[PDB]
Each structure stands twice: as structure tokens, then as C-alpha cells.
């Protein structure tokens, strides 16, 4: 257990120019002088800290630290608190250099080539052997799956709706966290993120830089002639393309998307992909499933149109199919499943789907350009809307942020804002606009909260920290970005760069929550396969994935037994392998994870 500075700071660094605050655990309510050091020991700068109070979410009582102005690049500077009285009057070593985020970037996009259903994992591309592993489900026993996957057995308890008997193959496409399920809806807004992450870069001139272009990934269509990061999504895609329910398999819902396929039933920790016994089954259609794939692959098409044509057209032609289907077919919810007992994967359920509507309307309109999409999204409520706290799915009304894998209006107001599109100018400036209020509000979150994160406690019933915090700050800091390229503001930019500070160990727990960064680094996510906490035979994670982060709604048993009830919630985590609700890993999080260090070391250069 590696002491708690207190001197909270960005526990690998910042970039030379930028706002830097760190955060004092101290009790003095008077200032107290700081020392920055370099490695050699030498002040090379010196001040007084900001106190604030006794900080909510933490119970700490804090001080800030603004050293701003110092952009001397360094390696292993460590702040001292000389006149304070305590053990851990100091920060960790941090770096003041331009290349903080640049390998960070390419690690967060790797780790969905490590998620990847249907292909072997390897050398090179894997980044160690230890991480090496056989294919996962194309239908070699131990796997029942996913070469022909039977719908869900209509006996089941919570079966769902009722399907017609048939077959799949619904190979490829990533497993969706710790588990070995794959999900339209979630997959949904990871793979959006990526395209996205893509087409601001293309339109801002930046798509032969990082991992935009051909070659810029480590990936096995790294020399192929497309862009790495499109040849990632397009493996996610060509998964939902075989998630369509086709005229052949039933005429009464072709067009209709898969809501997600994986075990009967849930397996434990420590095995592969390739190992998983269980049957496999397609849970039944849902109206998101099928928003979230008609407006991906409207996204897809229109990215992919010169590089693949062929592709592209069969992406439109599906998602216009999809779009129709789900039309006539509105209310169709994934309804919630218990996690005990029940179906092997998670819900995410969802009653409401007219923001995905509104998302795929928008998408489908900058691609096609067609009046029944510009007439549809006009009309929306959502039109133009960019939430600084949600009020959309449920489990999502009174939280701070702007969209999540099932309340995804925002999605299709930045694709309005980004891309150009036939929409009045004034209403593309009211989406521009909308982006710059929500961030507004998040900088006033930062200068209330003692540890500088864009977020505050819920304002739902049971308050706290909602299940996967970390992703919700990450999902602000887009949009942040977004501010950034529209008013050229840099306070938006100052934004992320507490964000990603907060994520980087300047925190009430002064954890890292990124596998392989930081003196105190993410060890012990809740993974099958990356588990050494199970058995010390399985591999320690790969870089640059991120944990869910605080929960405090105490949703598994070793959180429960970990920390008690009346605990702050930003110190409602563990970093162990068994706590799901506190320490997972996912797609929908490592994917504005990979946005905001790509965007972040753009920055840099």
C-alpha cells in the first residue's frame, strides 16, 4: 500500500502550457507554503496554497495548489509542504513534457483490438505475449458459439419477448467489458466515439496524424490502405451488420437489430475467451439496438465512401432498412434482467428511445441529406440539445453529464455541430452554442468540487457517484474539446486538463484509474482474462485502459465489505478484480477515454 501524498497532482503529468492545480489534503485553515522541487532536490519554484473547505464528495479538507504559469519541462518534479506536520508532506514525482498523452493514445485504442471476438490475438499486435491468446467463440468446443447462435429460449424466466426459432452466425465484434457478451446498444456509442474522434480529425486536416491513418495503429490492418482507427471501428460494425434480423429469419421484424448476444448464464473470473462453456443465445430485438445501428452505420457510410464504396453503400442501405424498421416498431425495450441467476450479460435496459431516434435521424441526415431525417430531427424534442446533466434513460436522470450509452441526444447534436449539413446556419450556431453552455457549467462543477472534476453527486434519489463515474467525466471532457475547436477558448481545454488530472491520481483516493500510468496505478480491474487477484498465472491488464471508477451505490459484495455505508462518494471504490461496480472495464469507456488522450496530445503538438 503506497502512502497517500498530500499533495494530490496528475500522477504522470501535464503538458508545458495549461492550467495545473493540485489538491492538498491538509488541515490548516491558514495557507501553507509550497515547494516545487526538481529530481535533484532543488526549489525551483515556491508559494502559499488556496485553502477551501472541507471538500463534500471527499470529506477532506483541502487546499489548492495553482502553479499554473510553471512550464519547465522536467522530469521527477515532487512538490514539499515544509512547515506541514505530516508523514506525507509531499506529491509523487510527476513530468512537465509535450509527450505526456502521446503513447497514452495509441494504448487506450489497443485495448479494443485486445477485445476482440473472432480472431486470434498476437504478436505483434497484442504488445506483450502474456496478452496473447486463441480466438474467442468461432464455434470450437469449449465455445457454443458464435457461428450459430439460437435465439433465446422462450422457457427462460426472463426470456424477454418472444422470437422465433433460428440461427446466426454473429461472429467478431468486441466483448463489451469483463465479460465475453457483445452489445449493439453500448457497442453503439463506442464505436460512434471512434468514427467521431475520426471525422473531427479529418475535418480539421489531422486525419495523416496519430492513429487516423493507415499504419497508425498496431493492429493487422495496419498496412492495408484504409485508416487504423476506421479498420477498428469496421470490426465492430461488421459484427452489427450480422446482429439484422433478416425477411428469411422473420418477415414481421426484418430490420430489427439483436440487443445483444452472450451466455445463458454468467461465468467466474479467470478464463479466456476461447474457454467459455456456456451456450450462447441472441437476446431478442430491441428499438435502441436498432437506432444504434441504423445511426453507426449511417456514420460509417459516409466515412468509408471513397476509401470502400462497396461497404459503404451496404452501411447506408442497412442503417436506412433499420431506420424504417424501427419506425414501425418503436416500443421495444430491453427490459431489466437481474445479474444473479439470470441471462449471462448485462441489460442495459432502457424505456425510452426517442433520443436515438433523434441521434439516427441525425446521422442519417449529414450522410443522405434527405428531407425525412431534416423534417424528423427538426421536430424532435432533442433538437439542437446538448445536456450538461441528464434528465433520458432512467438510471441517468439527475446525472451530471451529457450523454451515455442509452441517453445519446448529444451524440447527434455534435454530429449536427461538426459536420456541415443543410440545416440553417443559426440553428448549427444554437448546437455550437448549446456545447458551450453545457461546458460552462461543467467549469463551475471543477472550481466547486476540492479535487476539480466536471461532475457533482446525482440528483436522483440515492445521490452519490453513479456506477462507471470516471466515464461520465470523460464524455464531458468531448464535449469540452468540442467548445475548444468552436470559440477557441482555452479555458474549455483547461477543462480537460483537470479532468484527465482528477482521472490520473488528483482524486480522494490518489489512484490512478488507468491500467499502467501512475505511481498508484489501476492493478486490479474486473476482467476474465487480466486477473492475477484470481490466480497469479493470469497477465496484469494492458496500458492505458480505464476503470469505471467510484460507485457509491454499494452494487457488488466486495465494495460492501471494503468500505463503509457512510463513506464519501468519491472514495467509494476498490481497486480489486471482484468489484464489478466499482472497478470494470469497457468499451464505452476506454472509447472517450482513447477520444479525449488523442485529442489531449493533439493539443500538445
Known amino acids: 500500500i503506497l502512502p497517500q501524498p498530500d499533495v494530490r497532482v496528475n500522477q504522470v503529468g501535464y503538458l508545458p502550457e495549461g492550467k495545473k492545480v493540485a489538491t492538498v489534503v491538509c488541515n490548516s485553515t491558514q495557507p501553507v507554503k509550497w515547494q516545487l522541487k526538481n529530481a535533484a532536490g532543488v526549489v525551483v519554484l515556491e508559494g502559499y496554497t488556496e485553502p477551501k473547505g472541507l471538500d463534500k464528495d471527499s470529506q477532506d479538507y483541502v487546499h489548492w495548489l495553482d502553479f499554473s504559469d510553471f512550464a519547465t519541462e522536467g522530469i521527477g518534479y515532487y512538490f514539499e509542504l515544509p512547515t506541514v506536520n505530516s508523514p506525507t508532506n509531499y506529491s509523487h514525482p510527476f513530468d512537465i513534457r509535450k509527450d505526456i498523452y502521446t503513447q497514452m493514445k495509441y494504448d487506450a485504442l489497443a485495448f479494443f483490438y485486445h477485445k476482440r471476438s473472432g480472431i486470434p490475438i498476437e504478436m505483434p499486435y497484442a504488445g506483450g505475449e502474456q496478452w496473447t491468446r486463441p480466438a474467442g467463440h468461432i464455434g470450437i468446443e469449449p465455445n457454443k458459439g458464435d457461428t450459430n447462435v439460437p435465439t433465446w429460449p422462450q422457457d427462460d424466466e426472463y426470456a424477454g419477448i418472444p422470437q422465433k426459432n433460428y440461427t446466426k452466425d454473429v461472429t467478431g465484434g468486441w466483448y463489451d467489458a469483463g465479460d465475453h457478451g457483445k452489445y449493439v446498444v453500448n457497442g453503439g456509442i463506442a464505436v460512434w466515439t471512434l468514427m467521431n474522434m475520426y471525422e473531427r480529425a479529418k ?67 479467470g478464463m479466456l475467451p476461447h474457454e467459455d462453456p456456456q451456450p450462447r443465445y441472441l437476446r431478442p430485438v430491441s428499438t435502441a439496438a436498432t437506432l444504434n445501428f441504423a445511426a453507426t452505420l449511417a456514420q460509417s457510410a459516409r466515412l468509408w465512401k471513397d476509401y470502400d464504396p462497396t461497404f459503404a453503400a451496404d452501411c447506408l442501405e442497412k442503417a436506412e432498412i433499420a431506420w424504417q424498421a424501427a419506425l414501425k416498431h418503436p416500443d421495444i425495450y430491453a427490459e431489466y434482467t437481474p445479474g444473479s441467476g439470470g441471462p449471462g450479460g448485462g441489460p442495459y435496459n432502457d424505456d425510452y428511445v426517442g433520443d436515438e431516434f433523434y441521434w439516427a435521424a441525425c446521422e442519417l441526415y449529414v450522410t443522405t441529406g434527405k428531407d425525412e431525417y431534416k423534417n424528423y430531427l427538426m421536430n424532435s424534442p432533442h433538437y439542437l440539445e446538448m445536456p450538461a446533466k441528464m434528465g433520458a434513460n432512467g438510471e441517468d436522470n439527475g446525472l451530471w453529464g451529457c450523454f451515455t450509452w442509452g441517453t445519446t441526444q448529444g451524440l447527434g447534436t455534435i454530429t449536427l455541430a461538426l459536420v456541415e449539413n443543410g440545416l440553417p446556419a443559426t440553428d448549427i450556431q444554437k448546437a455550437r452554442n448549446n456545447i458551450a453552455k453545457a461546458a460552462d457549467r461543467w467549469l463551475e462543477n471543477i472550481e466547486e468540487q476540492g479535487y476539480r472534476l466536471p461532475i457533482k453527486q446525482a440528483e436522483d434519489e440515492r445521490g452519490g457517484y453513479p456506477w462507471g463515474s470516471n466515464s461520465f467525466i470523460l464524455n464531458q471532457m468531448i464535449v469540452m474539446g468540442y467548445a475548444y475547436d468552436f470559440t477557441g477558448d482555452s479555458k474549455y481545454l483547461d477543462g480537460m486538463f483537470d479532468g484527465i488530472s482528477y482521472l490520473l491520481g488528483r482524486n480522494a483516493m490518489d489512484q490512478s484509474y488507468v491500467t499502467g500510468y501512475g505511481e498508484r496505478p489501476l492493478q486490479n480491474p474486473h476482467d476474465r482474462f487480466w486477473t492475477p487477484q484470481t490466480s497469479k498465472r493470469f497477465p496484469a491488464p494492458p496500458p492505458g485502459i480505464i476503470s469505471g471508477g467510484p460507485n457509491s451505490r454499494f452494487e457488488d459484495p466486495t465494495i460492501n465489505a471494503a468500505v463503509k455505508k457512510d463513506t464519501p462518494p468519491q472514495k467509494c471504490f476498490i481497486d480489486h478484480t471482484d468489484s464489478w461496480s466499482t472497478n470494470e472495464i469497457t468499451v464505452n469507456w476506454n472509447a472517450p477515454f482513447a477520444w479525449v488522450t488523442a485529442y489531449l496530445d493533439q493539443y500538445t503538438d
Open 203 to 269: 475535418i480539421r486536416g489531422l486525419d495523416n496524424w496519430g492513429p487516423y491513418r493507415d499504419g497508425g495503429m498496431n493492429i493487422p490492418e495496419q498496412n492495408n490502405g484504409y485508416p487504423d482507427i476506421l479498420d477498428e471501428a469496421r470490426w465492430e460494425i461488421e459484427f452489427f451488420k450480422k446482429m439484422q434480423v433478416t425477411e428469411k429469419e422473420d418477415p414481421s421484424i426484418a430490420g430489427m437489430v439483436h440487443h445483444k448476444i452472450h451466455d445463458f448464464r454468467w461465468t467466474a473470473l
